[PDB]
């Protein structure tokens, strides 16, 4: 009767609202483009990229020789999901150590910001949740605040990086001999 | 009367909801691009690709000589079907053995992940359901976790592969002399 | 009155449903691309293509010399019809025999699959319903299962063919000297 | 009152149905592309194309010398009309005879099929309704069944033609010296 | 009240019907492309084109030398008007006579057909309503029936023309020395 | 109540009708392209273009040397206004006289037609309302009837002009030495 | 109840009307393209452009050498605002004086017209509201009436300018040695 | 009942209004393009860009040698947020001082205007909120009023800058030796 018609009309209104909300959520773009210059004097072998959030549509370049550039990119999961792209790239270095690069492009910018970090681990370590937590919570990550930051990585290596503050984040790092 | 009008309005609302759901289901893309480099010293002859899920729109390359690359791709079945693209590619090798490559790009990522595996079978074996089950459940498949994995295939052969974690999966494998 | 208004509303809903169904049925694509390599040592003269289902928009190439390739294609009938493209191509060979190639890309994949077959008939025979039934039900057709199949055709001829399992089917056959 | 509102709603529904039907009828394409190779040893002068159904948007080529090809095309009448393109092309030959080519691409394929015919008439005769009836009902036209058909035209002339079975019909004929 | 609401609904339905009808009427295309080859041995000077129906968007070429071609085109009046393009082109010839070419592409093909005519008038006469009536009703115009028609124009001149039967009419005439 | 709802529905219908009418009025195109060839033996200096109706989006070419062509164009005012493009172009000539060219492409073709005129005024006179009235009502303007018209301008000058009858009017004039 | 439903329907109608009105207001284009040729024998240094209405999206060219052309453009403020583009460009001249060019492309053409003016001020003066008022109300601006106007600027300088009457206004001025 | 239906209709109207408002807010563009020419005789090293409002999608160029140009751009935050792009770029100079450039393109132009400023700070200072407040409230910023402004920066340096008044702001500065 009248109640059923009102319920159906309300359901249709809720359906339209849900369609609009889902389209808006799916139209949100959170992508990261990582470019790392290798002036470290040693060849880099890709180990893995651990994605705490998001994913990548391309192959992680297996080898990055000295004087070359690692080019990589990722983005948030397809669909109306309120997650960004957060991850750690782990490359094996010729000296036997691991270069770890943390990137974080969050979905909700009301509570979170773009973050990035670079660190060198002794031995060959694959990027995982523990490495991400170390780089994000305990190793003093740099804010993606459209600023250049330099930090000595050790092992005769230093890093100079930059990351913008937008959702279309670009993380450019130069890892050079210290 | 009023009841019939309410029923028709509810049916129209359900029709609109069903149209939206079917369009969303059909817009989901699950495709796999397989690239296998042959540095095994022997020529590969295509046997078959068994698709547990999905299909392919191209011909499986009949011959892959040493130093060449097998390029292949597949995708999930057209239409609003909640299935991914899961399959095994079987190539005959010159020594008389079979190279089997398992790929798995699931539809529902809440329960499943991207998987891949590489194995060498003695004799000439065509890819089928049993081979897929062996490669997916009992031969320790590698997760498609944006990481490089290496494993000795035996018969003087080793494999080094990579697979991303997204629905637009790329599986790059190098099968080289051990 | 109220009954007439309800009937008209139901008719409009049925009209919208019918429009959506017809559009979906018409958007289904079932096409076949046939490529046959002639390494038989004899020239092929086109006889005819009998379409059990579907049709073709191009001319069947009249002559296919040795070392050349027959290129042909067909698709299902235009409009919202639940039929695929099923047919037999009959070519006359220089020795006086007929090369018959059966292709079958069904509309309903719930009950049917892609099928193909190659056979050589003594004498000059045009493709028709009987030839299609022979090739589809009694001459052991190969499944379009993304696999390479080889079969001796006789008369000093062998065939090696491939057909994928999708609705956008490609049938590649090489008919060579045995 | 209520009756008038119901009548107006029904009229609107009928208007929508009529619009959809007219759009579907107008979207139906029936076109014919005629290509006739002249290896008859004599020049052909265009006489006329009588369209039993449909029309053409181009000029009938006035002269077709020996070794050249007549290219022509036509289509069904613009608008939502349930008629195909049926006609006869009449060319004058140098010997004083007429080459008549019948083409028929019907609108309703439930009752009709593609047909074509080739004939040589003594003297100079223009294509008309009587010639079309002769070629379609009494001179054994060839079915447009994706098959090659050969027939001796007489006067030291033979014809070898092909016509597909689809609505986008192509009629390729070679009229050569017998 | 209810009557006013019914009247407004009927007015809206009539508005939608009128919009559809006007769009359909405006989408009807009736254009003519005239190409006249001058092999008369004398130069042609444009006098005027009298449009009984329709209009032209280009300049009538002032001079057409011997061995050149007059290219002209016209179309029906813009907007939803049920009129075709009917007119007479009058060119002055070097000998002091007038070449008049009548073209007629009607809007309603249920009652009318494409017509064309060619005539030579003594003296310099501009195309007007009387000339159009003479060429259309009393000088035996040729039907635009996809046929070639030849007629001696006199004054040592003959004409050979062709006109298709469609609304996108092309009228090709060759006026040569008799 | 019911009256207010009926009033609102009628207002919405009137709004839709008004939107359609305004869109149709704004889609009406009335533009004029003027091309004047100067074979008068004297240089022309632009004085002004007085637009009785419409406007122009380009600069009136300041100088038109002998043997060159003045290219100009205008159109009706943007928006749903029922006005055409009517104006007079006044150029100063080297001898000290003024060349005035009247063009008139009306909006309503039910009452008005395309008109054009060419005149030479003694002295330097700028185009204005009085000059337009003189050229349109008292100096015998030529109708834009797709016809070539010639008239001696005096001062050792003659003009030969052409103007089509459509709303996309082109006015081509040649002002040459008499 | 019924009153609330009527109020909501009226509010929706008003919303649709407001959306249409705002779209129409925002679709109105009022832009000015200024081109000033410098044949004054002195270099021009840009001082500023004071926009009484509208704005510009480009940089005012800092230097305009003798024999070069200043190219500039502006437009009305983005959004549905009923304002045109009115401003004064002030350039510093090498002699120590200021060249001021007033342009005015109004929004409402029912009350206003295109205006322009050129003046030379002693000393270096920046364009402001007072300069605009002087050039628009007291220094006899030229109407943008598709006419060429010349005026001696003084200081051994004269100006010859042109401005059309449309909303897509072009103001071309040549400032030359007197 | 009736109340619930009225509430649902009002909610739908509010939803449509909110969708329109959000689309309008998101369609507002506020971007800044900064171009700074370095004729200071010293190399510039990027320190950081502090965005009080908005963000940037590109990397701040690390080095700007003498005679080169810094190219940078930013825009307001994506989505329907009523914020502009306001920030300070801080570059390190070879002499040990900092070049700070303030840009401000506000969202609400009813209360705010485009502003810019250039200053040199002793020592190496990173752009932050305090620097922005200093440059915007206490160091006399130049208005983005389409005017060229010059100011001695000190330390043997002077600046000459320009900024337009539109939301698509361009800020061009030349920092040269004083
Ligand atoms: C009713 C149903 C409500 C369902 C709400 C689901 C919310 C999911 C948020 C993502 C998440 O459950 N968790 C996170 C994913 O967001 P992200 O990709 O931006 O990661 C955050 C960055 N960081 C480095 C991991 C900290 C995040 O916590 C979100 C929202 C906060 C709540
Ligand atoms: C009411 C009607 C409900 C109908 C539900 C149909 C669900 C079909 C799911 C696909 C499937 O029936 N089965 C599978 C196909 O999904 P897939 O292509 O991602 O394959 C899974 C990967 N794996 C390697 C085969 C394991 C899968 O099990 C789905 C969903 C889980 C339930
Ligand atoms: C109420 C009205 C219902 C009308 C249903 C019409 C169904 C027509 C199906 C096609 C068909 O009547 N018959 C067939 C055409 O499908 P196809 O093109 O895929 O051919 C099948 C393959 N094969 C090699 C010929 C076997 C087929 O049998 C369909 C459906 C099964 C029922
Ligand atoms: C209520 C109003 C119904 C009006 C129905 C009009 C149907 C017109 C069909 C075309 C036609 O009245 N007659 C024909 C035109 O179709 P065609 O162009 O395909 O020609 C047929 C082929 N042939 C060589 C001429 C035989 C044909 O007979 C159609 C339909 C059969 C009925
Ligand atoms: C209620 C209002 C009805 C208004 C109907 C107006 C019809 C106008 C038809 C055109 C016309 O009033 N008259 C004609 C224009 O059509 P045409 O351009 O095709 O010219 C016909 C060809 N001919 C060479 C001139 C004969 C023609 O008579 C139309 C229709 C016949 C009625
Ligand atoms: C209720 C409100 C009705 C408002 C009607 C306004 C009509 C304006 C017509 C243009 C005009 O008020 N006047 C004219 C502009 O049309 P035009 O641009 O085609 O100029 C006519 C040509 N001529 C050379 C100037 C004669 C013309 O008179 C229109 C219509 C006739 C009425
Ligand atoms: C109810 C709310 C109504 C709000 C109406 C606002 C009207 C704003 C008009 C612009 C304006 O408030 N004032 C002006 C801006 O228009 P313009 O850009 O064309 O400038 C006019 C040209 N001139 C050189 C400055 C004179 C002008 O006066 C408009 C309209 C007249 C009223
Ligand atoms: C009910 C909910 C209402 C919510 C209103 C939110 C308004 C946010 C305005 C932006 C802001 O909260 N604050 C500012 C951001 O705007 P902006 O990017 O143009 O910065 C202004 C320029 N300035 C150099 C920083 C001064 C500004 O104050 C806006 C509006 C004034 C109020
Ligand atoms: C009123 C009744 C029918 C309940 C309706 C619940 C709706 C509003 C809930 C149920 C499931 C929810 C979704 C569940 C998961 C996600 C993924 C997350 O990353 C973003 C939010 C999103 C997309 C939620 C949006 C809101 C949602 C659609
Ligand atoms: C309320 C009455 C009419 C029953 C309605 C049942 C509807 C909701 C059911 C019936 C058949 C169902 C479909 C059957 C098969 C598939 C393929 C699967 O891979 C994804 C889901 C999908 C696409 C289902 C979606 C839901 C579905 C359309
Ligand atoms: C219910 C009352 C108003 C009668 C409605 C009659 C309608 C359905 C009839 C009247 C005229 C008919 C049209 C008349 C002529 C043709 C051309 C033919 O080649 C195809 C069908 C077509 C296009 C008809 C379609 C149906 C039609 C539009
Ligand atoms: C019911 C009341 C409001 C009367 C409605 C009358 C309508 C249907 C009439 C009035 C004026 C008519 C138009 C007048 C002139 C022409 C130009 C002609 O070449 C084609 C028909 C066309 C386009 C008519 C179509 C039908 C028309 C719009
Ligand atoms: C019923 C009540 C609200 C009165 C409605 C009056 C409407 C129909 C009137 C009022 C103002 C009118 C417009 C006023 C001016 C012009 C410019 C003219 O060149 C073409 C007509 C046009 C565009 C008119 C169209 C009709 C119009 C919109
Ligand atoms: C009537 C009941 C449901 C309350 C509705 C409140 C609506 C109108 C309010 C709640 C939250 C508000 C938004 C909150 C934040 C922002 C960001 C700001 O930069 C622009 C305005 C904007 C986008 C607001 C627009 C209006 C808004 C959507």
mmCIF file of C-alpha atoms in Angstrom, chain A residues 34-48 60-72 89-101 117-121 123-124 153-160 171-178, chain B residues 148 160:
data_model
loop_
_atom_site.group_PDB
_atom_site.id
_atom_site.type_symbol
_atom_site.label_atom_id
_atom_site.label_comp_id
_atom_site.label_asym_id
_atom_site.label_seq_id
_atom_site.Cartn_x
_atom_site.Cartn_y
_atom_site.Cartn_z
ATOM 1 C CA UNK A 34 59.148 6.098 -7.673
ATOM 2 C CA UNK A 35 62.375 7.078 -9.393
ATOM 3 C CA UNK A 36 65.649 6.108 -7.720
ATOM 4 C CA UNK A 37 69.021 7.084 -9.173
ATOM 5 C CA UNK A 38 71.870 4.684 -8.385
ATOM 6 C CA UNK A 39 75.211 6.461 -7.984
ATOM 7 C CA UNK A 40 76.286 4.028 -5.273
ATOM 8 C CA UNK A 41 78.969 2.280 -7.328
ATOM 9 C CA UNK A 42 77.250 -1.108 -7.023
ATOM 10 C CA UNK A 43 74.575 -2.951 -8.971
ATOM 11 C CA UNK A 44 71.105 -3.339 -7.466
ATOM 12 C CA UNK A 45 69.119 -6.565 -7.794
ATOM 13 C CA UNK A 46 65.390 -6.376 -7.140
ATOM 14 C CA UNK A 47 64.179 -8.416 -4.187
ATOM 15 C CA UNK A 48 60.519 -7.448 -3.789
ATOM 16 C CA UNK A 60 59.789 -4.418 -10.586
ATOM 17 C CA UNK A 61 62.989 -3.909 -12.638
ATOM 18 C CA UNK A 62 65.275 -6.809 -11.813
ATOM 19 C CA UNK A 63 68.594 -4.993 -12.274
ATOM 20 C CA UNK A 64 69.559 -1.357 -11.716
ATOM 21 C CA UNK A 65 73.208 -0.860 -12.626
ATOM 22 C CA UNK A 66 75.308 1.978 -11.260
ATOM 23 C CA UNK A 67 74.485 5.197 -13.071
ATOM 24 C CA UNK A 68 71.024 3.956 -14.068
ATOM 25 C CA UNK A 69 67.594 4.764 -12.652
ATOM 26 C CA UNK A 70 64.973 2.486 -11.142
ATOM 27 C CA UNK A 71 61.534 3.464 -12.447
ATOM 28 C CA UNK A 72 58.514 2.017 -10.663
ATOM 29 C CA UNK A 89 60.712 -1.621 -2.113
ATOM 30 C CA UNK A 90 63.648 -3.875 -1.226
ATOM 31 C CA UNK A 91 66.600 -4.162 -3.613
ATOM 32 C CA UNK A 92 69.687 -6.296 -3.085
ATOM 33 C CA UNK A 93 72.991 -4.453 -3.404
ATOM 34 C CA UNK A 94 76.256 -5.870 -4.707
ATOM 35 C CA UNK A 95 77.979 -5.431 -1.336
ATOM 36 C CA UNK A 96 75.483 -7.843 0.228
ATOM 37 C CA UNK A 97 73.180 -5.279 1.854
ATOM 38 C CA UNK A 98 69.575 -4.312 1.171
ATOM 39 C CA UNK A 99 68.249 -0.924 0.074
ATOM 40 C CA UNK A 100 64.740 -0.359 1.445
ATOM 41 C CA UNK A 101 62.554 2.524 0.270
ATOM 42 C CA UNK A 117 61.962 6.795 3.932
ATOM 43 C CA UNK A 118 65.229 5.265 2.751
ATOM 44 C CA UNK A 119 67.368 2.859 4.747
ATOM 45 C CA UNK A 120 70.112 0.287 4.234
ATOM 46 C CA UNK A 121 69.834 -3.043 6.048
ATOM 47 C CA UNK A 123 72.355 -8.607 4.729
ATOM 48 C CA UNK A 124 69.687 -9.550 2.213
ATOM 49 C CA UNK A 153 72.483 5.974 4.768
ATOM 50 C CA UNK A 154 75.805 4.627 6.006
ATOM 51 C CA UNK A 155 77.994 1.981 4.400
ATOM 52 C CA UNK A 156 79.572 4.812 2.431
ATOM 53 C CA UNK A 157 76.161 5.808 1.077
ATOM 54 C CA UNK A 158 73.982 8.897 1.334
ATOM 55 C CA UNK A 159 70.507 9.641 0.014
ATOM 56 C CA UNK A 160 68.808 12.813 -1.220
ATOM 57 C CA UNK A 171 59.089 10.078 -4.990
ATOM 58 C CA UNK A 172 62.482 10.910 -6.487
ATOM 59 C CA UNK A 173 65.537 9.639 -4.608
ATOM 60 C CA UNK A 174 69.243 9.787 -5.446
ATOM 61 C CA UNK A 175 71.339 7.211 -3.593
ATOM 62 C CA UNK A 176 74.962 8.250 -4.073
ATOM 63 C CA UNK A 177 78.352 7.425 -2.632
ATOM 64 C CA UNK A 178 78.848 9.242 0.661
ATOM 65 C CA UNK B 148 61.228 -11.970 -7.586
ATOM 66 C CA UNK B 160 63.579 -16.737 -12.007
#
